[PDB]
Design a binder for this molecule. Structure first.
Ligand SMILES: [Gd]
Ligand SMILES: [Gd]
Ligand SMILES: [Gd]
Ligand SMILES: [Gd]
Ligand SMILES: [Gd]
Ligand SMILES: [Gd]
Ligand SMILES: [Gd]
Ligand SMILES: [Gd]
Ligand SMILES: [Gd]
Ligand SMILES: [Gd]
Ligand SMILES: [Gd]
Ligand SMILES: [Gd]
Length: 248
């Protein structure tokens, strides 16, 4: 699939394609493929539920999505979803201060962009994540950022990858009420790690800039921080190259 979706405040112009569904506050994707979004949506959620064997690309091509009850992007199931920031385009995602859970015992989603699965953010374009509820970009598996001009403002943690967080490129600017980057998988093999191999990263955080259980690696990157806690909190191993971690 290769679908185009355009929001104009309270109208949606979408291609008719397999598995795609547009409701009042929901664009639901259930088949693999590419989905390109643009325009302003006053109140909505992009919901991805395509199964653990399938992949999708969400191309943000100048979108401005607010959600008054939940996360603007919720990936319920995928093998992997890639988020692509279109060259020269301003993408803004704003979530609610308190999420409403239709099953009031659920606490997921809990991030402005939340994925139960692998997510990769890539591209030359711009992304601003206004995360009022909890975390900014969150996944129960591995978060990867390979590029983009990415600004996160988070009530809790900026980037949260339970499995891992990898940053190999991009211009990333994080403001967090707790940790800038947080990883917590104590369970799985070769998880619980933060790996920064490129890019420019600025972190202002009331607690730690990077908080990881098993490992933090930094090289060939420019990481500048301002923290209330520690620059790097990690009881595991630290492989940090000199001249990469500094103060903001
Ligand atoms: Gd309504
Ligand atoms: Gd696959
Ligand atoms: Gd598989
Ligand atoms: Gd509100
Ligand atoms: Gd460019
Ligand atoms: Gd309500
Ligand atoms: Gd549920
Ligand atoms: Gd329900
Ligand atoms: Gd998963
Ligand atoms: Gd690039
Ligand atoms: Gd993974
Ligand atoms: Gd922390």
């Amino acid at each position: 699939v290769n679908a185009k979706i355009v929001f104009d405040n309270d109208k949606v112009n979408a291609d008719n394609v397999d598995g795609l569904s547009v409701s009042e506050r929901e664009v639901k994707i259930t088949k693999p493929g590419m989905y390109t979004f643009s325009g302003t949506w006053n109140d909505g959620q992009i919901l991805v539920d395509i199964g653990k064997e399938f992949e999708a690309v969400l191309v943000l091509d100048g979108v401005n999505i607010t959600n008054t009850k939940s996360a603007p992007i919720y990936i319920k199931s995928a093998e992997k979803v890639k988020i692509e920031l279109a060259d020269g385009k301003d993408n803004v995602l704003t979530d609610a201060e308190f999420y409403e859970f239709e099953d009031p015992q659920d606490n997921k989603p809990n991030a402005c962009i939340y994925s139960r699965d692998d997510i990769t953010i890539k591209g030359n374009g711009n992304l601003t994540v206004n995360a009022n509820f909890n975390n900014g970009i969150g996944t129960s598996n591995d978060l990867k950022i390979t590029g983009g001009n990415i600004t996160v403002k988070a009530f809790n943690n900026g980037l949260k990858g339970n499995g891992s967080v990898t940053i190999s490129g991009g211009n990333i600017d994080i403001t967090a009420g707790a940790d800038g980057i947080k990883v917590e998988n104590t369970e799985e093999p070769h998880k619980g790690y933060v790996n920064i191999t490129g890019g420019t990263i600025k972190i202002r955080a009331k607690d730690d800039a990077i908080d990881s259980v098993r490992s933090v690696s930094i090289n060939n990157a420019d990481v500048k921080v301002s923290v209330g806690g520690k620059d790097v909190k990690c009881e595991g191993v630290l492989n940090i190259a000199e001249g990469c971690l500094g103060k903001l």
